[PDB]
Amino acid sequence: SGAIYVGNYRVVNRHLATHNDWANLVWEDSSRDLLVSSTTAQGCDTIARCDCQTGVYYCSSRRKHYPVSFSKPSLIFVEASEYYPARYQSHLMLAVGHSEPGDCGGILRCQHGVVGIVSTGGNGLVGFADVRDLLWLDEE
Numbered sequence: 001s002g003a004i005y006v007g008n009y010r011v012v013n014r015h016l017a018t019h020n021d022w023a024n025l026v027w028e029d030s031s032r033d034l035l036v037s038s039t040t041a042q043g044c045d046t047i048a049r050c051d052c053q054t055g056v057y058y059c060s061s062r063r064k065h066y067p068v069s070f071s072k073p074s075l076i077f078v079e080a081s082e083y084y085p086a087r088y089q090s091h092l093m094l095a096v097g098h099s100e101p102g103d104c105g106g107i108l109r110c111q112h113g114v115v116g117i118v119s120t121g122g123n124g125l126v127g128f129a130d131v132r133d134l135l136w137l138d139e140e
């Protein structure tokens with residue numbers, strides 16, 4: 001589990017969104033595994049607007065933050081899970097690292113801010129849904 005709290009937005013994995021998220025919906029995209037809902041309180045996370053391909057992510061199944069090198073956002077094929085069939089996911093970045101279902105939602109960050117959240121896993125890989133192109137998260 002986990003979310004990004006930027007401004008009056010909450011960014012979560014679409015497959016983990018709650019009823020309150022759906023009832024306060026701003027934007028969702030199944031191809032990216034992302035959903036954004038509105039919040040009453042202002043958040044403290046800042047979104048990275050950069051070209052970093054190294055950073056650190058939080059792994060809940062280890063209670064640890066790990067440094068990683070990750071690929072550029074791309075269209076990748078992901079195996080079936082409890083939430084989606086096997087398919088292509090867009091704006092996904094892969095790295096070598098530990099990731100269980102329960103680890104989705106952990107933040108990937110660099111010195112500039114939040115880069116994305118854990119969205120896929122297995123066999124020593126971790127995949128992150130990028131948020132750096134969603135410029136509108138910084139306004140309204």
Ligand SMILES: NC(=O)[C@H]1CCCN(C(=O)C[C@@H]2CSCCS2)C1
Pocket residue numbers: 015033078079080081082083084089099100101102103104118119120121122
């Ligand atoms: N975004 C998706 O299509 C994923 C939906 C949840 C399941 N999924 C995985 O890759 C399983 C990994 C287990 S390792 C922990 C992180 S998820 C596919």
Ligand SMILES: [Zn+2]
Pocket residue numbers: 048049050051052110111112113
């Ligand atoms: Zn950066």
